[PDB]
Amino acid sequence: IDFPFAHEDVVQKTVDDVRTLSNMSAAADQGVHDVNHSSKTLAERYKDDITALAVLPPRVDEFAKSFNDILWAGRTSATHGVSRITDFVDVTVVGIVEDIKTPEDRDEAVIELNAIAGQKSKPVDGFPGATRRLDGIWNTSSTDAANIAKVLAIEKTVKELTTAFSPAKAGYKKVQEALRAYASSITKLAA
């Protein structure tokens, strides 16, 4: 029963991944706006004499807005990533799997981990960088849920489960905060 985020080396690699995804989005968005700004200033610089230069900024602006939508599609996937980790770690694992009592309780536990492992993610169209690193994190949860759920079918196994998953929690919260900061940053980009 390995938990990829129970190891500090994996957690850092994953936090970097998200940082890299956040920073890239910032850099690229600026790059697009600098191009867009530069385009506008140029047409303004020769607006009296060169009338055709006005045709360009609108073309660069229509793209800039398409680009912003993709960046916000990325944000949306990141927030669902934050939600997902809360539902796995806090609602399911700590809420149910650590507080297991009755058949009717674990009836929730093993199912609720199954519903989690069965969930998939909308990819970010035109942003395969975001799709790849986000799916990688989404799927760590799916795999950890599955593993945990297979290791039922009691009270002995649960104390081992709790103890074994414990090192993963700080890992998960580390990754959740990275995603949460990436999602926050996107909202602030247009400023």
Q: What does the binding site for its own copies look like in residue numbers (CB under 8 A)?
A: 24, 28, 31-32, 34-35, 38-39, 42, 45-46, 48-53, 55-56, 59-60, 63, 66-67, 70, 125-130
- Site size for Na ion (CB under 5 A): 5
Q: Is residue 138 close enough to count as binding Na ion by CB under 5 A?
A: no
Does 88 sit near Na ion (CB under 5 A)?
Answer: no
115 binds, among its own copies, Na ion, none (CB under 5 to 8 A by kind): none
93: DSSP letter: I
* Radius of gyration for the chain, computed over Cα atoms and rounded to the nearest angstrom: 22
Smaller CB distance to its own copies: residue 95 or 129?
129
Residue 128 touches which member of Na ion, its own copies, none, C-beta under 5-8 Å by kind: its own copies
Nearer residue to its own copies within complex by CB, 125 or 160: 125
Residue 64 C-beta: closest distance to its own copies, Å = 9
Return d(Cα 178, Cα 165) in angstroms, integer. 20
Question: If you write DSSP's letter for every residue of 14-50 in order, what string do you get?
Answer: HHHHHHHHHHHHHHHHHHHHHHHHHHHHHHHHTTTT-
Does 3 help bind Na ion (rule: CB under 5 A)? yes
Given the complex with its own copies, which of 52 and 153 has the nearer CB atom? Answer: 52
The least distance separating its own copies from the CB of residue 50, rounded to whole angstroms, comes to 6
DSSP string, 105-161: HHHHHHHHHHHHHH------TT-HHHHHHHHHHHHHHHHHHHHHHHT---HHHHHHH
Q: Which amino acid is it at 129?
A: G
* Site for Na ion, residues 153 to 172, rule: CB under 5 A: 168
Contact between residue 183 and residue 75 where contact means Cβ atoms under 8 Å apart = yes
What residue 5 binds from its own copies, Na ion, none (CB within 5 to 8 A, per partner kind)? Na ion
Q: Which two tokens stand for residue 64?
A: 């800039």
The contact set with Na ion (CB under 5 A) reads 3-5, 144, 168
